[PDB]
Amino acid sequence: TESNTAGVSVNVGYQNGFTANVTTNYSHTTDNSTAVQDSNGESWNTGLSINKGESAYINA
Amino acid sequence: YTDYEKASGSFDKAIKTEARDPLVAAYPIVGVGMEKLIISTNEHASTDQGKTVSRATTNSK
């Protein structure tokens, strides 16, 4: 649940006791949204040297 | 489903309420809609090479 609560509207004020947020996107716990970890300062291009025409390939 | 199973609802619970009437026929009508046109210049493994144009599209049943 990160894409589920991504489209939240914060709205620091609540109207009538409905102290709950509403979202335009409430999907499921079957929508895992990965988060790359290291990404220190280097791009993916560094160490790959790709220039606007060719492609990389994913293992996971 | 027979008349009694339709009237009482002793069928799959996902069947619409309207089909409970023994005259309305329980019936799925499946159609395929398209929501993006992508036209590329390649026919087999069209990655990395062609010059393509695509747009999001609507449709109507």
mmCIF file of all heavy atoms in Angstrom, chain B residues 12-38:
data_model
loop_
_atom_site.group_PDB
_atom_site.id
_atom_site.type_symbol
_atom_site.label_atom_id
_atom_site.label_comp_id
_atom_site.label_asym_id
_atom_site.label_seq_id
_atom_site.Cartn_x
_atom_site.Cartn_y
_atom_site.Cartn_z
ATOM 1 N N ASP B 12 -25.329 -18.218 -8.813
ATOM 2 C CA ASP B 12 -24.151 -17.436 -8.474
ATOM 3 C C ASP B 12 -24.567 -16.048 -8.010
ATOM 4 O O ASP B 12 -25.397 -15.394 -8.641
ATOM 5 C CB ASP B 12 -23.226 -17.348 -9.685
ATOM 6 C CG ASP B 12 -21.936 -16.629 -9.380
ATOM 7 O OD1 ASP B 12 -21.146 -17.145 -8.563
ATOM 8 O OD2 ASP B 12 -21.706 -15.551 -9.962
ATOM 9 N N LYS B 13 -24.002 -15.608 -6.885
ATOM 10 C CA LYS B 13 -24.434 -14.357 -6.273
ATOM 11 C C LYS B 13 -24.023 -13.129 -7.067
ATOM 12 O O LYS B 13 -24.512 -12.035 -6.769
ATOM 13 C CB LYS B 13 -23.887 -14.251 -4.848
ATOM 14 C CG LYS B 13 -24.715 -14.996 -3.814
ATOM 15 C CD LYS B 13 -26.176 -14.593 -3.914
ATOM 16 C CE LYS B 13 -27.088 -15.603 -3.256
ATOM 17 N NZ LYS B 13 -28.507 -15.332 -3.597
ATOM 18 N N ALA B 14 -23.150 -13.275 -8.062
ATOM 19 C CA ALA B 14 -22.735 -12.147 -8.883
ATOM 20 C C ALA B 14 -23.714 -11.837 -10.005
ATOM 21 O O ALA B 14 -23.614 -10.767 -10.613
ATOM 22 C CB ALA B 14 -21.352 -12.406 -9.474
ATOM 23 N N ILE B 15 -24.651 -12.739 -10.293
ATOM 24 C CA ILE B 15 -25.631 -12.500 -11.340
ATOM 25 C C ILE B 15 -26.511 -11.323 -10.954
ATOM 26 O O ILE B 15 -26.968 -11.217 -9.809
ATOM 27 C CB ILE B 15 -26.458 -13.771 -11.582
ATOM 28 C CG1 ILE B 15 -25.575 -14.845 -12.211
ATOM 29 C CG2 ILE B 15 -27.666 -13.474 -12.450
ATOM 30 C CD1 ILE B 15 -26.313 -16.079 -12.586
ATOM 31 N N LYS B 16 -26.745 -10.429 -11.910
ATOM 32 C CA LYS B 16 -27.449 -9.186 -11.635
ATOM 33 C C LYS B 16 -28.818 -9.458 -11.027
ATOM 34 O O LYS B 16 -29.460 -10.473 -11.296
ATOM 35 C CB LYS B 16 -27.611 -8.369 -12.913
ATOM 36 C CG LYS B 16 -26.411 -7.525 -13.262
ATOM 37 C CD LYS B 16 -26.107 -6.539 -12.160
ATOM 38 C CE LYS B 16 -25.716 -5.197 -12.738
ATOM 39 N NZ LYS B 16 -26.773 -4.675 -13.640
ATOM 40 N N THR B 17 -29.259 -8.519 -10.187
ATOM 41 C CA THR B 17 -30.578 -8.619 -9.573
ATOM 42 C C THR B 17 -31.680 -8.673 -10.617
ATOM 43 O O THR B 17 -32.709 -9.322 -10.400
ATOM 44 C CB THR B 17 -30.811 -7.434 -8.640
ATOM 45 O OG1 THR B 17 -31.851 -6.606 -9.174
ATOM 46 C CG2 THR B 17 -29.545 -6.605 -8.507
ATOM 47 N N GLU B 18 -31.485 -8.000 -11.747
ATOM 48 C CA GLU B 18 -32.515 -7.926 -12.772
ATOM 49 C C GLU B 18 -32.789 -9.273 -13.413
ATOM 50 O O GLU B 18 -33.919 -9.518 -13.841
ATOM 51 C CB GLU B 18 -32.107 -6.917 -13.840
ATOM 52 C CG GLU B 18 -30.713 -6.359 -13.651
ATOM 53 C CD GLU B 18 -30.665 -5.252 -12.621
ATOM 54 O OE1 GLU B 18 -31.735 -4.889 -12.086
ATOM 55 O OE2 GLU B 18 -29.560 -4.742 -12.346
ATOM 56 N N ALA B 19 -31.791 -10.148 -13.485
ATOM 57 C CA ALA B 19 -31.959 -11.466 -14.073
ATOM 58 C C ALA B 19 -32.721 -12.418 -13.171
ATOM 59 O O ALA B 19 -33.022 -13.539 -13.591
ATOM 60 C CB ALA B 19 -30.597 -12.070 -14.417
ATOM 61 N N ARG B 20 -33.035 -12.004 -11.944
ATOM 62 C CA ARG B 20 -33.840 -12.845 -11.069
ATOM 63 C C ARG B 20 -35.225 -13.081 -11.646
ATOM 64 O O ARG B 20 -35.807 -14.149 -11.439
ATOM 65 C CB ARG B 20 -33.949 -12.215 -9.688
ATOM 66 C CG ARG B 20 -32.848 -12.612 -8.743
ATOM 67 C CD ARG B 20 -33.299 -12.433 -7.312
ATOM 68 N NE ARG B 20 -32.181 -12.128 -6.427
ATOM 69 C CZ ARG B 20 -32.313 -11.827 -5.142
ATOM 70 N NH1 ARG B 20 -33.518 -11.791 -4.590
ATOM 71 N NH2 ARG B 20 -31.242 -11.564 -4.409
ATOM 72 N N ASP B 21 -35.764 -12.106 -12.355
ATOM 73 C CA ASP B 21 -37.065 -12.273 -12.976
ATOM 74 C C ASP B 21 -37.013 -13.426 -13.968
ATOM 75 O O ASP B 21 -36.132 -13.452 -14.831
ATOM 76 C CB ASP B 21 -37.483 -10.993 -13.680
ATOM 77 C CG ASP B 21 -38.969 -10.909 -13.879
ATOM 78 O OD1 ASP B 21 -39.489 -11.623 -14.759
ATOM 79 O OD2 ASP B 21 -39.621 -10.137 -13.149
ATOM 80 N N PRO B 22 -37.930 -14.393 -13.885
ATOM 81 C CA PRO B 22 -37.861 -15.556 -14.779
ATOM 82 C C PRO B 22 -38.078 -15.225 -16.245
ATOM 83 O O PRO B 22 -38.100 -16.143 -17.070
ATOM 84 C CB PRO B 22 -38.978 -16.468 -14.252
ATOM 85 C CG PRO B 22 -39.319 -15.945 -12.904
ATOM 86 C CD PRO B 22 -39.056 -14.486 -12.949
ATOM 87 N N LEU B 23 -38.258 -13.956 -16.597
ATOM 88 C CA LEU B 23 -38.339 -13.542 -17.988
ATOM 89 C C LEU B 23 -37.036 -12.968 -18.509
ATOM 90 O O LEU B 23 -36.698 -13.192 -19.675
ATOM 91 C CB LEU B 23 -39.444 -12.501 -18.169
ATOM 92 C CG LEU B 23 -40.849 -12.958 -17.798
ATOM 93 C CD1 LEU B 23 -41.853 -11.882 -18.149
ATOM 94 C CD2 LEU B 23 -41.177 -14.254 -18.507
ATOM 95 N N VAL B 24 -36.301 -12.234 -17.680
ATOM 96 C CA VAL B 24 -35.012 -11.683 -18.080
ATOM 97 C C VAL B 24 -34.001 -12.816 -18.107
ATOM 98 O O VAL B 24 -33.815 -13.523 -17.113
ATOM 99 C CB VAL B 24 -34.565 -10.563 -17.135
ATOM 100 C CG1 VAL B 24 -33.261 -9.978 -17.612
ATOM 101 C CG2 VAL B 24 -35.620 -9.491 -17.063
ATOM 102 N N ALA B 25 -33.355 -13.002 -19.248
ATOM 103 C CA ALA B 25 -32.429 -14.106 -19.417
ATOM 104 C C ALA B 25 -31.066 -13.734 -18.854
ATOM 105 O O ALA B 25 -30.470 -12.735 -19.265
ATOM 106 C CB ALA B 25 -32.311 -14.475 -20.893
ATOM 107 N N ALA B 26 -30.583 -14.534 -17.904
ATOM 108 C CA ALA B 26 -29.215 -14.385 -17.427
ATOM 109 C C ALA B 26 -28.262 -14.502 -18.605
ATOM 110 O O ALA B 26 -28.240 -15.524 -19.297
ATOM 111 C CB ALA B 26 -28.900 -15.441 -16.372
ATOM 112 N N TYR B 27 -27.486 -13.455 -18.841
ATOM 113 C CA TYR B 27 -26.795 -13.368 -20.116
ATOM 114 C C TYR B 27 -25.604 -12.424 -20.045
ATOM 115 O O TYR B 27 -25.765 -11.251 -19.693
ATOM 116 C CB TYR B 27 -27.785 -12.896 -21.177
ATOM 117 C CG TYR B 27 -27.361 -13.138 -22.597
ATOM 118 C CD1 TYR B 27 -26.844 -14.356 -22.990
ATOM 119 C CD2 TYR B 27 -27.503 -12.151 -23.550
ATOM 120 C CE1 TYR B 27 -26.471 -14.571 -24.286
ATOM 121 C CE2 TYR B 27 -27.129 -12.360 -24.846
ATOM 122 C CZ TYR B 27 -26.614 -13.569 -25.210
ATOM 123 O OH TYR B 27 -26.243 -13.776 -26.514
ATOM 124 N N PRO B 28 -24.399 -12.893 -20.360
ATOM 125 C CA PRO B 28 -23.259 -11.985 -20.501
ATOM 126 C C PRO B 28 -23.062 -11.532 -21.938
ATOM 127 O O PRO B 28 -23.122 -12.321 -22.881
ATOM 128 C CB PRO B 28 -22.087 -12.855 -20.038
ATOM 129 C CG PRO B 28 -22.478 -14.225 -20.473
ATOM 130 C CD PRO B 28 -23.984 -14.302 -20.425
ATOM 131 N N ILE B 29 -22.815 -10.238 -22.106
ATOM 132 C CA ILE B 29 -22.555 -9.650 -23.416
ATOM 133 C C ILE B 29 -21.209 -8.944 -23.336
ATOM 134 O O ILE B 29 -21.110 -7.838 -22.792
ATOM 135 C CB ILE B 29 -23.666 -8.687 -23.852
ATOM 136 C CG1 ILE B 29 -24.999 -9.420 -23.963
ATOM 137 C CG2 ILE B 29 -23.339 -8.076 -25.187
ATOM 138 C CD1 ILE B 29 -25.909 -9.210 -22.785
ATOM 139 N N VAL B 30 -20.177 -9.576 -23.889
ATOM 140 C CA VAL B 30 -18.790 -9.153 -23.733
ATOM 141 C C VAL B 30 -18.337 -8.449 -25.001
ATOM 142 O O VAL B 30 -18.439 -9.007 -26.099
ATOM 143 C CB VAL B 30 -17.879 -10.348 -23.429
ATOM 144 C CG1 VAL B 30 -16.480 -9.875 -23.112
ATOM 145 C CG2 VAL B 30 -18.443 -11.149 -22.284
ATOM 146 N N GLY B 31 -17.808 -7.235 -24.849
ATOM 147 C CA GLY B 31 -17.242 -6.511 -25.964
ATOM 148 C C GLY B 31 -15.898 -5.921 -25.590
ATOM 149 O O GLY B 31 -15.637 -5.596 -24.435
ATOM 150 N N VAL B 32 -15.038 -5.792 -26.596
ATOM 151 C CA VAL B 32 -13.664 -5.339 -26.409
ATOM 152 C C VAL B 32 -13.563 -3.900 -26.883
ATOM 153 O O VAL B 32 -13.824 -3.606 -28.055
ATOM 154 C CB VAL B 32 -12.664 -6.229 -27.160
ATOM 155 C CG1 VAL B 32 -11.250 -5.779 -26.871
ATOM 156 C CG2 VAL B 32 -12.849 -7.679 -26.770
ATOM 157 N N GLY B 33 -13.171 -3.010 -25.986
ATOM 158 C CA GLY B 33 -12.935 -1.615 -26.324
ATOM 159 C C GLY B 33 -11.448 -1.331 -26.364
ATOM 160 O O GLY B 33 -10.661 -2.026 -25.720
ATOM 161 N N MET B 34 -11.066 -0.316 -27.132
ATOM 162 C CA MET B 34 -9.669 0.057 -27.304
ATOM 163 C C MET B 34 -9.430 1.454 -26.749
ATOM 164 O O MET B 34 -10.236 2.363 -26.970
ATOM 165 C CB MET B 34 -9.264 0.009 -28.778
ATOM 166 C CG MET B 34 -7.833 0.437 -29.040
ATOM 167 S SD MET B 34 -7.557 0.918 -30.748
ATOM 168 C CE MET B 34 -8.165 -0.532 -31.589
ATOM 169 N N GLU B 35 -8.317 1.626 -26.032
ATOM 170 C CA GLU B 35 -8.036 2.907 -25.402
ATOM 171 C C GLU B 35 -6.633 3.441 -25.676
ATOM 172 O O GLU B 35 -6.196 4.373 -24.991
ATOM 173 C CB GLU B 35 -8.296 2.826 -23.893
ATOM 174 C CG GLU B 35 -7.189 2.243 -23.043
ATOM 175 C CD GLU B 35 -7.343 2.634 -21.586
ATOM 176 O OE1 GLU B 35 -8.421 2.380 -21.012
ATOM 177 O OE2 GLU B 35 -6.394 3.210 -21.018
ATOM 178 N N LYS B 36 -5.927 2.907 -26.673
ATOM 179 C CA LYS B 36 -4.718 3.552 -27.168
ATOM 180 C C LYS B 36 -4.371 2.998 -28.538
ATOM 181 O O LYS B 36 -4.312 1.783 -28.728
ATOM 182 C CB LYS B 36 -3.524 3.360 -26.228
ATOM 183 C CG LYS B 36 -2.337 4.245 -26.581
ATOM 184 C CD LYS B 36 -1.171 4.043 -25.634
ATOM 185 C CE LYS B 36 -1.401 4.726 -24.298
ATOM 186 N NZ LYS B 36 -1.211 6.197 -24.372
ATOM 187 N N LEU B 37 -4.137 3.899 -29.487
ATOM 188 C CA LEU B 37 -3.646 3.547 -30.814
ATOM 189 C C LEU B 37 -2.154 3.829 -30.863
ATOM 190 O O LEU B 37 -1.729 4.974 -30.684
ATOM 191 C CB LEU B 37 -4.374 4.324 -31.903
ATOM 192 C CG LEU B 37 -5.282 3.477 -32.780
ATOM 193 C CD1 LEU B 37 -6.164 4.358 -33.640
ATOM 194 C CD2 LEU B 37 -4.440 2.545 -33.623
ATOM 195 N N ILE B 38 -1.367 2.789 -31.108
ATOM 196 C CA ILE B 38 0.077 2.895 -31.245
ATOM 197 C C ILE B 38 0.430 2.345 -32.615
ATOM 198 O O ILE B 38 0.196 1.164 -32.893
ATOM 199 C CB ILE B 38 0.818 2.132 -30.144
ATOM 200 C CG1 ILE B 38 0.134 2.341 -28.794
ATOM 201 C CG2 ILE B 38 2.277 2.549 -30.102
ATOM 202 C CD1 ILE B 38 0.669 1.450 -27.696
#
